[PDB]
């Protein structure tokens, strides 16, 4: 299904793996998808998170508090966690329901909040961004793009 991801959404997934690697992590979790959405810096997901006061530094601090780093950066392919897999599956449905045949950054963010249970969701709530508020912000920004 990666064939349906936009270039920027693919870049987010590629960057999520490197967010994990540079933290000496051995799985790509939902929190690394969150970091990648912010760090790539251009798409509707990044805009939505910035506009809710969710910064890369806020997320990094919470990930260090909740997960912490390993001892060594791994080589090779880092596997997705069960919850990260669920996020990427759910992204497909978010896109279809919003009338898109492609999966953009916003749909990965929407999948992440739909899963709603893993480390990224915990971080967002801890940083003051309730899941319904994140969803409604994405909708609000998307509506502005229809002008």
């Amino acid at each position: 299904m990666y064939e349906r991801f936009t270039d920027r959404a693919r870049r987010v997934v590629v960057l999520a793996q490197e967010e994990a690697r540079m933290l000496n992590h051995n799985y790509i979790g939902t929190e690394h998808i969150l970091l990648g959405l912010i760090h790539e810096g251009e798409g509707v997901a990044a805009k939505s998170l910035e506009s809710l006061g969710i910064s890369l530094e806020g997320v990094r601090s919470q990930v260090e508090e909740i997960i912490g780093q390993g001892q060594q950066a791994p080589s090779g392919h880092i596997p997705f966690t069960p919850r990260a897999k669920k996020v990427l599956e759910l992204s497909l449905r978010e896109a279809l329901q919003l009338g898109h045949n492609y999966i953009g950054t916003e749909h990965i963010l929407l999948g992440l909040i739909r899963e709603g249970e893993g480390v990224a969701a915990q971080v967002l709530v801890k940083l003051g961004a309730e899941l319904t508020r994140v969803r409604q912000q994405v909708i609000q920004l998307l509506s502005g793009y229809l002008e």
């Binding site: 299904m1 990666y2 693919r10 997934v13 590629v14 999520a16 793996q17 790509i28 392919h77 880092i78 596997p79 997705f80 897999k85 990427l88 599956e89």
Partner: peptide
């Protein structure tokens, strides 16, 4: 799809 980047 759906285990690694980008399978």
């Amino acid at each position: 799809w759906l285990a690694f980047v980008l399978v």
